[PDB]
Amino acid sequence: RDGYPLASNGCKFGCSGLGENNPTCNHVCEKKAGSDYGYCYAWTCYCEHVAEGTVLWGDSGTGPCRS
């Protein structure tokens, strides 16, 4: 299951312009998603094979990500 639902209106995984060092998006994807498919454009991070039952409400970069 793809991971582009952006459940958390604030942020899904790492990657966040207006935020601290939240590069977890890398390990996160290759950890629970066990895949190297990530998409970061704005203040947030996307991934594949993460929405397959897993959770999605902000990782480390979450918080001051997007409104």
Curated annotation (Swiss-Prot):
Keywords: Disulfide bond, Ion channel impairing toxin, Neurotoxin, Secreted, Toxin, Voltage-gated sodium channel impairing toxin. Transmembrane segments: none annotated. It is found in: Secreted. Coiled coil: none annotated. The keyword Disulfide bond applies. Residues 1-66 form the LCN-type CS-alpha/beta domain. PROSITE patterns: LCN_CSAB (PS51863). It comes from the Eukaryota. InterPro entries: LCN-type_CS_alpha_beta_dom, Scorpion_toxin-like_sf, Scorpion_toxinL/defensin. Disulfide bonds join C11-C65, C15-C40, C25-C45, C29-C47. One of its GO terms (cellular component) is extracellular region. One of its GO terms (molecular function) is toxin activity. Signal peptide: none annotated. Expressed by the venom gland. Has the structural arrangement of an alpha-helix connected to antiparallel beta-sheets by disulfide bonds (CS-alpha/beta). Alpha toxins bind voltage-independently at site-3 of sodium channels (Nav) and inhibit the inactivation of the activated channels, thereby blocking neuronal transmission. This toxin binds, in vitro, to sodium channels and inhibits the inactivation of the activated channels. Seems not toxic to mice, crickets and sweet-water shrimps. Belongs to the long (4 C-C) scorpion toxin superfamily. Sodium channel inhibitor family. Beta subfamily. This is Alpha-toxin Cn12. It comes from Centruroides noxius.
